[PDB]
Design a protein around this ligand. Structure first.
Ligand code: NA
Ligand code: NA
Length: 162
């Protein structure tokens, strides 16, 4: 298991524009296109992201290309963020992947606002951090996925992704 396989499990793969769990136009492996309710706006973002006129459909290779860019962006966003970087640097590789997963799903700014959870993770109070992470809109709206990510933070193992 690794961050790419973990996020493939959590995000799936769909080659036509679809709406994500929040109702937003998305394609590929959780590649958010736009929050606009306009399918035309989403199609425009997609063509711009892929570099051709796609008419809302991409190939698996193209989906994987966007996915790698999005994973890289999540890692880079963590490392550029004054609140997320010390937490990331303090963690083992498995828990680092859990943090990348959260940033991929909710964004750098969103995760950086989890001040109390981040402190508990920095303190390596794993059960406490897991309890705090679940007191969130994130957990309530996507509980099965949040449970997997939280278990990864709690245990430092890949047990939730078997
Ligand atoms: Na330490
Ligand atoms: Na997540």
């Amino acid at each position: 298991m690794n961050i790419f396989e973990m996020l493939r499990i959590d995000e799936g793969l769909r080659l036509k524009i679809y709406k994500d769990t929040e109702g937003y136009y998305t394609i590929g492996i959780g590649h958010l296109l736009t929050k606009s309710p306009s399918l035309n706006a989403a199609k425009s973002e997609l063509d711009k992201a892929i570099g051709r006129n796609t008419n809302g459909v991409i190939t698996k290779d193209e989906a994987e290309k966007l996915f790698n860019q999005d994973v890289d962006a999540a890692v880079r966003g963590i490392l550029r963020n004054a609140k997320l970087k010390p937490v990331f640097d303090s963690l083992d590789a498995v828990r680092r992947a859990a943090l990348i997963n959260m940033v991929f799903q909710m964004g750098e700014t969103g995760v950086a606002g989890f001040t109390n959870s981040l402190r508990m993770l920095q303190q390596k109070r794993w059960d406490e951090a897991a309890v705090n992470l679940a007191k969130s809109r994130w957990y309530n709206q996507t509980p099965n996925r949040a449970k997997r990510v939280i278990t990864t933070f709690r245990t430092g193992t890949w047990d939730a992704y078997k």
